[PDB]
Each structure stands twice: as C-alpha cells, then as structure tokens.
Amino acid sequence: TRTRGYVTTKDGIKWYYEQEGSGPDVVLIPDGLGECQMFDKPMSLIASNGFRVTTFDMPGMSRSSDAPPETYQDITGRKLAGYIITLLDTLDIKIASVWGCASGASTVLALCSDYPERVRNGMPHEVPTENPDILLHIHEVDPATISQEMAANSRAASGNVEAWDALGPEVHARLHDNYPRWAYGYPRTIPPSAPVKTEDLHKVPIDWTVGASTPTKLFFENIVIAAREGINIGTLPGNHFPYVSHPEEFAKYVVETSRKYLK
Amino acid sequence: TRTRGYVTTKDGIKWYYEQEGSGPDVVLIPDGLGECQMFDKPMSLIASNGFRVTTFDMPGMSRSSDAPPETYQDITGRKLAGYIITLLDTLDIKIASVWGCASGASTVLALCSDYPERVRNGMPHEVPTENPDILLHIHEVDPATISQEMAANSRAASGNVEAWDALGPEVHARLHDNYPRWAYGYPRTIPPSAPVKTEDLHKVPIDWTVGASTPTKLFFENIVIAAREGINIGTLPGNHFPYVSHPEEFAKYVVETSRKYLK
Numbered sequence: 001t002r003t004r005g006y007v008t009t010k011d012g013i014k015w016y017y018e019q020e021g022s023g024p025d026v027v028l029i030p031d032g033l034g035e036c037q038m039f040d041k042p043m044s045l046i047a048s049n050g051f052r053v054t055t056f057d058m059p060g061m062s063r064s065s066d067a068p069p070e071t072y073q074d075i076t077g078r079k080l081a082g083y084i085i086t087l088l089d090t091l092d093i094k095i096a097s098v099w100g101c102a103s104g105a106s107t108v109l110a111l112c113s114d115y116p117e118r119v120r121n122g123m124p125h126e127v128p129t130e131n132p133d134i135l136l137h138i139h140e141v142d143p144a145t146i147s148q149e150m151a152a153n154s155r156a157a158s159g160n161v162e163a164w165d166a167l168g169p170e171v172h173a174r175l176h177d178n179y180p181r182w183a184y185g186y187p188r189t190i191p192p193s194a195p196v197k198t199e200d201l202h203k204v205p206i207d208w209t210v211g212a213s214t215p216t217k218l219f220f221e222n223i224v225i226a227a228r229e230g231i232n233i234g235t236l237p238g239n240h241f242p243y244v245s246h247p248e249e250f251a252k253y254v255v256e257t258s259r260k261y262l263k
Numbered sequence: 264t265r266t267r268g269y270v271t272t273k274d275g276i277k278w279y280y281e282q283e284g285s286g287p288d289v290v291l292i293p294d295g296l297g298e299c300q301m302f303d304k305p306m307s308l309i310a311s312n313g314f315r316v317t318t319f320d321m322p323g324m325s326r327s328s329d330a331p332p333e334t335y336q337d338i339t340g341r342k343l344a345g346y347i348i349t350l351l352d353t354l355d356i357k358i359a360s361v362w363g364c365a366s367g368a369s370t371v372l373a374l375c376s377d378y379p380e381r382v383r384n385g386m387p388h389e390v391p392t393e394n395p396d397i398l399l400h401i402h403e404v405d406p407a408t409i410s411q412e413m414a415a416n417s418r419a420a421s422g423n424v425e426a427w428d429a430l431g432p433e434v435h436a437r438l439h440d441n442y443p444r445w446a447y448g449y450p451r452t453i454p455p456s457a458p459v460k461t462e463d464l465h466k467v468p469i470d471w472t473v474g475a476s477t478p479t480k481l482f483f484e485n486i487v488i489a490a491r492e493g494i495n496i497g498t499l500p501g502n503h504f505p506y507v508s509h510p511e512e513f514a515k516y517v518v519e520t521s522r523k524y525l526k
C-alpha cells in the first residue's frame with residue numbers, strides 16, 4: 001500500500017518519500033518545484049500495473065526542506081543524481097526506470113551518464129538547455145515577487161489549470177515556499193550543465209519527451225539532439241507537468257515505455 | 264511599384280497574382296487559406312531589398328476562386344507544385360527562392376523534389392505530416408460550421424491576433440469563403456502526400472522553419488525529419504502565419520536566407 005515517511009541520509013538530507021506497489025522499480029523524480037504530491041494519482045496507476053514506484057520531495061523543497069543549503073544551491077543534474085543515488089541505496093533500490101521533468105530531466109540523464117548501471121531506462125522530459133526570457137532575471141528579485149511570478153508561470157504551464165488548481169491548498173502553500181529557493185539554486189546552473197553530450201546519451205536506454213502543447217521554441221533543442229543521436233523522442237499530452245495534467249496518459253507512457261526493457 | 268492582375272492558365276485556373284521589385288525571383292506561396300494579401304507588407308520589404316517578389320491567391324481561393332473543381336480538391340503538394348510551375352512559366356520566372364507554410368510548405372518541398380531546376384532554395388514552414396484532432400472531421404460538416412470553426416482556429420494559430428484582425432474585413436470576408444473549400448480538399452490529402460522522404464530533400468538547399476510559439480506536437484516531426492536529414496532547421500517568431508504576425512522578422516529571414524544562395 002502507499003507508504004509515506006522520512007529518512008535522513010548520510011549527506012544531511014531529511015527526505016520525504018513515498019512508495020507503493022511491488023515489482024520492478026520506477027523512480028519518479030520531480031521537476032524543479034520538487035513536489036512529489038504531483039505524482040500522487042499516476043503513482044497509484046503505475047504501481048497497479050505491477051511496479052514498485054518510488055518518489056520523494058526534492059532536497060530543500062517541500063517536506064524535504066530540512067536539508068543542507070548546498071543541496072539546493074548551485075544545482076546541476078549531476079549534483080542531484082549524487083543525492084538520488086545515495087537515497088536509492090538506503091531504500092535498497094539497485095536498478096530503476098527513472099522519470100524526470102525539467103531539472104529532473106537533467107537528473108535522469110546525469111544518472112544515465114554517471115550511474116548507468118542503476119538505470120534500466122531513463123525517461124527525460126523537457127531538458128533545460130536554454131532558459132526562456134521570463135527566467136533570465138528570476139534569481140535577481142525578491143522572494144515574494146518570485147512566488148507571485150513563478151506561481152503564474154507554473155500555473156500557465158500546467159497544461160490543465162483545473163487539475164493544477166485541484167492539487168489543493170496544502171500543496172500550493174508548499175509550492176509557494178519552494179518557488180524562491182528554486183530560483184536561487186536552479187535556473188542559472190541547470191541549463192549549462194545539461195548532460196546532452198554524445199557521451200551522456202548512449203550508455204543505457206533513453207526515451208525522450210516534450211510537452212505536446214509546449215511552445216516549440218522552449219525545448220526545440222531537445223528534439224534536435226535526440227534526432228541527431230538516434231534517441232527515441234516524442235510528445236506527451238500537456239506541457240511541463242504531464243503527470244498532473246494528464247495522469248492516465250502519463251502513467252500509460254511510463255508503463256508502456258518501461259515495459260519494453262524488462263528481462 | 265506593385266503590379267496586380269490575373270492570368271488564366273492552360274489548366275483553366277484564373278490566377279490572381281501580384282509582383283513587385285527587381286532582381287532575382289522570390290516566390291511566396293500562401294498557406295492553405297490561399298490569401299496572398301497576408302504577404303502585403305513583407306512583400307514590400309523583401310522587394311526593396313533587391314528582389315522581384317511574386318505571390319498569388321491559390322487556386323479556388325480568394326481572387327483565384329474561379330478555378331476548376333479539381334484544382335482545389337484532393338490537394339497534394341505535388342498538384343499545387345504542378346499548377347505553380349505552369350503559372351511561373353507564363354510569368355517568365357525560371358528559378359526562384361520559394362517560401363511556403365503548411366500546404367504551401369508541402370508545395371515548396373514538392374517543387375524542390377520534382378522541379379529542382381526551378382528552385383534556388385526552399386523555405387518550408389510547418390509541413391503538415393499529421394493533423395491535430397481539431398481537423399479530423401472538418402471535411403465532414405457543413406460550410407457555415409467550418410467557417411465558424413476554422414476562423415477561430417486560424418485566429419488562435421495566428422501568432423498575433425491584433426494583426427490577424429488587422430488584415431481587415433475584406434480579407435476576412437474572402438477567408439470566410441475559403442474555409443470550407445480548404446476543408447473539403449486539403450486536410451485529408453495534404454499530410455499523407457508530404458514530400459519529406461530522403462530523396463525529396465537533397466536536390467536544392469532547404470531552410471526549414473517552425474513557429475516559435477506553435478505547440479510542439481503540431482510540427483514536431485518536421486524538426487525530427489530535418490535533424491535526421493541534416494537539413495537546416497530553426498524557428499520563426501509566432502505560430503502558423505509569421506508573415507502576418509511578424510512582417511519585418513519574416514522578411515528579414517527570407518531576404519537573408521535567399522541572398523546566401525546567389526551567385
């Protein structure tokens with residue numbers, strides 16, 4: 001059944017994490033906002049397809065907020081993979097299908113490249129390689145301003161405002177606090193460290209996606225890199241948060257995608 | 264400086280065309296709506312950068328609506344390419360830099376494939392290779408419903424609704440009659456006919472664009488095929504009508520792209 005709890009790791013981080021189901025492992029890493037409650041409904045669905053699903057709030061974010069300051073500053077996919085790895089060890093997850101959007105997509109690839117042996121297959125979605133105009137000075141302003149701004153930016157990029165609002169008051173209060181921390185630690189340093197070099201993308205299976213309704217320019221490069229490299233590239237319904245806006249379809253893609261690599 | 268007129272070709276089409284400027288030929292093929300008045304400003308800008316610019320209302324559309332039934336039904340890029348060659352011959356245009364969006368883009372590629380001796384360089388924009396669900400039954404309904412649905416869809420996909428509205432009432436009155444005719448003859452046949460096979464794309468230079476704001480899924484495959492084929496691919500500001508939403512940027516792109524293939 002769904003287990004909800006904490007575990008503190010050797011690196012200082014008090015992770016909030018959730019688990020459900022049984023079978024082969026699926027890890028659901030959050031996008032930059034670090035809020036694993038976005039995964040709630042799809043988590044049940046994947047699990048019920050014969051999977052053990054793991055997810056967690058990200059370091060410094062939400063209920064994982066009791067963490068060391070460096071674990072949410074100067075963030076890269078590789079920094080994040082390091083922490084995920086040491087968390088997976090405590091949970092005895094040896095090999096996993098790994099999903100992530102945004103900076104969490106940065107993390108998928110970082111793991112695919114740096115810890116290939118722990119990735120059965122990586123599912124990155126919208127790897128930041130250039131930030132849009134709206135983020136260029138997001139780290140320069142005040143917390144309240146960022147929370148006001150980033151809540152509308154995320155809300156607009158929800159891909160389904162009904163479902164985005166429907167995440168609820170508890171979640172959006174947590175998100176209100178993550179927004180500022182996210183701006184100070186993620187936007188500048190995530191795109192330039194995107195592991196999309198040739199030598200990152202071929203050590204294990206990768207199925208790349210982009211949001212169906214995301215404006216082409218935002219992750220245009222994602223599609224060209226994947227095509228050039230012969231990496232499976234496609235879309236999913238919605239935009240930046242398919243697991244929230246289109247939970248069923250998202251959970252079907254994870255299931256379908258992971259399915260083809262099981263042996 | 265600008266000439267406007269008609270020419271009935273041996274295939275029975277009564278073409279409305281416009282020319283302006285002097286020098287190497289640039290041909291601007293409309294999108295599915297077939298309304299060459301959308302090219303008014305860009306056509307002025309391009310021509311004074313030292314080009315003879317030609318455009319036209321597409322067969323059966325707008326001021327070229329006096330055309331035989333076959334010329335606006337079961338439409339493919341290749342059929343459109345065939346009528347346009349026939350028209351180009353009668354205007355003594357031997358070789359041209361050619362732009363086109365949508366089914367215009369289809370025609371650009373079909374021109375690049377089957378009439379390579381006529382193309383200096385190809386500028387396709389948003390080649391339809393599949394349809395969004397919004398068009399899947401558009402050929403099945405009555406005209407007034409199509410005109411109501413398709414005006415909003417094109418307005419929504421305009422890239423800049425102010426300037427779309429600013430095309431004026433006379434332009435939109437012609438579009439009103441173009442919608443059903445486009446729906447009955449284009450959607451079903453254009454995508455399956457897309458000349459995007461390997462042998463279609465390496466006879467003349469191709470510079471491929473997709474609207475910066477356009478939902479990724481709409482022309483996602485365009486970016487894949489171009490990246491796979493080593494064909495230059497980029498974005499333009501806006502969506503489906505970059506010549507309407509951003510005249511100056513559009514004309515700069517066309518001018519500079521084509522200049523680079525003069526000799």
Ligand SMILES: C[C@H]1CCCC(=O)CCC/C=C/c2cc(O)cc(O)c2C(=O)O1
Pocket residue numbers: 031032033101102103104128130131132153154157182186187188190191240
């Ligand atoms: C906060 C989240 C939703 C933010 C939604 C949003 O504003 C869309 C812009 C896309 C950029 C996302 C992004 C970019 C980065 O450089 C680093 C990131 O961690 C993210 C990212 O996680 O986006």
Ligand SMILES: C[C@H]1CCCC(=O)CCC/C=C/c2cc(O)cc(O)c2C(=O)O1
Pocket residue numbers: 294295296364365366367391393394395398416417420445449450451453454481503
């Ligand atoms: C009418 C125009 C703008 C129509 C506005 C619009 O519906 C945007 C959707 C993109 C699809 C365009 C399209 C698809 C086809 O199969 C054939 C076409 O001729 C077009 C196309 O020309 O769309």
